[PDB]
Amino acid sequence: ATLNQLPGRLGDPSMSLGTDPRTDPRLAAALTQLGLADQAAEPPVNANSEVADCIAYSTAAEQAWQTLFAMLGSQGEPSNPVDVREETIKGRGGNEIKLYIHSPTGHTSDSDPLPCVVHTHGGGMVILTAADANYSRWRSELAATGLVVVGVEFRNAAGALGNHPFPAGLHDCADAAKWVASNREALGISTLIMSGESGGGNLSLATTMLAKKEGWLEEIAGVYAQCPYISGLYASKPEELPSLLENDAYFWDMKTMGAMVKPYDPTGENASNPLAWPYHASLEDLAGLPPHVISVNELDPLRDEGLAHYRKLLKAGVSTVGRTVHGTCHAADCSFVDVIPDVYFATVRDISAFAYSRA
């Protein structure tokens, strides 16, 4: 920042990704070409909308986001060859959960075992699917570094895979992690970490807390949570989270997320439940968790709830690394592979090295 001007929209309410001096200029140029450098448009729903209207809107927004991320995601392929296979498992309640299993070509149960990432994709726990091109690309790029990556096709609160409120998606992620943990020799894996971004960061964090609650925490060796979407407080502007106003309408408007909270928790009864919104965890909830990495984006309205959770994990005694990825809007290092490849692959390499460090 600068001593006479607070950053972002705290210092200049008209600022956008396109005019913020902090934006990586390659990302700013790509967003400008896509029409997404200006402040995000006003959504037709908000936290005052009825749940059914929030569900309907989310189901419509899913296609728009999938189109954008499909463009960014599907223009290339990993530098090392990767195999992808599908497996269907049974969730605790009897539903079928599809898993996309990515691994280096030639990896078998007879190879030397590789570290494993159980990947929980973003979309606010409400929209997007593991089969989407950006998430398939991400899992394959991780696999190409020498990993087995398991993409969980969990139930969503809305959209094509809806409509399943909390805790459906969490249970699917947890059951997928338990299946991976019970199939280490068949998968040819050494260690298991949870990782995902935004809503998937929430799910990766919450899955690990659920493992603690259910007594199988020992199966999870670590968590790499990117730009976690974990407070649920997007309707308001808690003083504790200035980034919500500093970077509002940078890619995401906070009214949109306030509306997308409702499909996840239609009754609102889980607003302070740490399994739904990990930001609300107590120190006792976080005690004993395995090592964490929290990686936030600089120009992201969610930045400060991720950093707050990093600090609480440390206060609870969890081994935690905290990283800001500069120059990026929300989750940009997960998708803009053609525009900021060095940033994208820096994050891929960081996740992979962390996974290896846990084996």
Next chain:
Amino acid sequence: LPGRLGDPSMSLGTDPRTDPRLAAALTQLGLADQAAEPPVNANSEVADCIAYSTAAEQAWQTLFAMLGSQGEPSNPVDVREETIKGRGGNEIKLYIHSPTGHTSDSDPLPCVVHTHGGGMVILTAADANYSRWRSELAATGLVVVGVEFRNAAGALGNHPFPAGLHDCADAAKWVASNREALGISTLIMSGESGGGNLSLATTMLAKKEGWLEEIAGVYAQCPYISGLYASKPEELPSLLENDAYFWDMKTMGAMVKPYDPTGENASNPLAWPYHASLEDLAGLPPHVISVNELDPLRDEGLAHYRKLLKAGVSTVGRTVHGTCHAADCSFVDVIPDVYFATVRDISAFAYSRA
């Protein structure tokens, strides 16, 4: 407002952002409270600044050796010494770290030419914390070349800019000319604080001298690159926000003068890379700038990250949260996950350039 912008009495020990493990270690070291003011400042005579730096060197070496003096790398490492000649005829010692069994007949490994910190004024490549760092990097599968460059003060003094820079450049050129003999593929400059300055400036100098193609990348940690610690510009709020977090800026203002006694290089990018023009940076190879959150130097590092991007350089920018200046380079017993996250990040970057 964070840190001392919001509470002028705040220190590393009371800042809510400090990693509590690091805060406890600093408390035990007497370094959690606001750093002491030095007996010299930027208005002191050059001779007094040199004398102060020379006196302080041994105390800092003892402290940093405590942190990097108990553990050894998980993988075995060999260290050998080589002495080369600088452009001016002086002898430059090199400490070469590599995995045990690595030879010119092995498959070649990526190389890091490491330029240590100390404000370009004090500390040596032989210090235990820097030897430990180079060995931990080598243990990941790297050849690491520690440059024993001339300093502006202390045991290796007294040599102002550009002596140390020329030594780092000449060492990098020697490495680039001995790739088969070292068993190395690619080469990346890396260092922290004053060593971040030297790694950045060595690469800019390679562009000016026509050998830039030899350097495949730069990983610059918490770079000490503005030289503006006496005056604290508005554009660098961290200078106030985190002042006396480990370092008081009067101390660094005093340590500027041995490097540039006349002040005539205050805006020279080879002395202080923060002052680079876009033209100075055009065409440089990929960079990573990694700053510390609770570091008065944070904002000049981030400003340079943004300038590299504006110049068209592929640049990744990272904040290491919860850390004071260069903590992820030394406090391995206290925050090993942070320390090794950085070691792994540097090594992965080096491999990514091969």
